[PDB]
Design a protein around this ligand. Sequence first.
Ligand SMILES: N[C@H](C(=O)O)c1ccc(O)cc1
Ligand SMILES: N[C@H](C(=O)O)c1ccc(O)cc1
Lengths: 392, 60
Amino acid sequence: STVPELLARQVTRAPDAVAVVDRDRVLTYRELDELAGRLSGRLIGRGVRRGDRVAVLLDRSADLVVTLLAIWKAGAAYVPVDAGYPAPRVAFMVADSGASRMVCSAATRDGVPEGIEAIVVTDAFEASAAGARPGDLAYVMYTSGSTGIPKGVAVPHRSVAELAGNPGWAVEPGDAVLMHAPYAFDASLFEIWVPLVSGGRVVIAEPGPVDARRLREAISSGVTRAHLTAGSFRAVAEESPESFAGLREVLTGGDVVPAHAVARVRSACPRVRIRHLYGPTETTLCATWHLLEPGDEIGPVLPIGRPLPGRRAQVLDASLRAVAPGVIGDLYLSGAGLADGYLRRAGLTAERFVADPSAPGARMYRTGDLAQWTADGALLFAGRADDQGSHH
Amino acid sequence: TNPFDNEDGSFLVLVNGEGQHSLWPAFAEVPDGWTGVHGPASRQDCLGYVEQNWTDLRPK
Ligand SMILES: N[C@H](C(=O)O)c1ccc(O)cc1
Ligand SMILES: N[C@H](C(=O)O)c1ccc(O)cc1
């Protein structure tokens, strides 16, 4: 599948439902589709062709959502660049990804590198679409992991759709999801694409970081689901856990989240669902998750959890044999959601996206993390393999 | 040390039906659906084989 295909089902079902809320600008599903179609026509007219990478340099806004969908409708893949990155980082991402064009705004126009065509989103071609396809690239997102060397993770449409359309998200048409993660990072796949394939709405956060007070205001305005980075979640959980009250679900992940933080939220908010996400950019936002239902208490340990529907995890020893529960080993992720690999880096791809001994002809992603199973099949994180010098 | 990072290990290159390449430790049974196309050879030699011969990441 592709996210545009899944979105099209929602445009047909409820075209006049709200899709994007940005300050006083409100876009319905049909309005979002039509705007993206017009910008797609503009992109095709500037020469964008299937498989091209198109860089994006924009502040979060309705125009950003329109732009990503337009790039997809033109058959191309987006290369998201944070407008606040230093110029050498931007130049590297554009050149390494092979992007010859960049969509920008008046405000970000000066950040387009020399030699790159700027397409100013706020500036007569007719709406036209080539159409997204499942095997084509959807985006190239840059990750340095724990290495310090940035690599472009090339993710196909099929993997983005497997993530966004997953039945476990439980996002419904009445939901409103707060959008504030950088679109250069893949938490944005939950904040943007999950609600849109589900019939819900994306609520663009006012500029600046989302703190407890802004979260309370967003909830009062109708936000029902919100993802916070592990750092932000831990802070609000310890300082103002009642600020999550009224959410249907709070989500968090990335860095380590201690069980105590989750326990603080559950104590303050008995009826909020709390979801912990785990996974690398290489397997599209998250591969495993742990959900605390309303009223349930978290144990002494917060698992990274169980594989998402359609995914699998393995914990293998140094001989590539599966270990028994309670034994720490190397974590490998498989099933749905794998990236194609690292753009222009086949050798690196071949040493991390490796053959899966448990599934014919398939690959598994070597996370570089350590984990152990619980007796009934959830996973506990045990640190990065390259950070065991910190465990004493 | 993870076996895929062992610089003193012996390695194969494997290729599946989609043309995707994988390094593989020579001590491990080759998974179903994968064919050995290079090695046993050093880890670095296998990376060179992959870089030379896997030119399009897209699955065939
Ligand atoms: N921890 C590093 C990184 O984030 O770059 C890593 C090593 C091996 C691996 O298979 C994945 C990641
Ligand atoms: N995919 C990123 C990561 O590499 O860590 C991620 C972000 C947020 C989250 O809740 C889970 C994973």
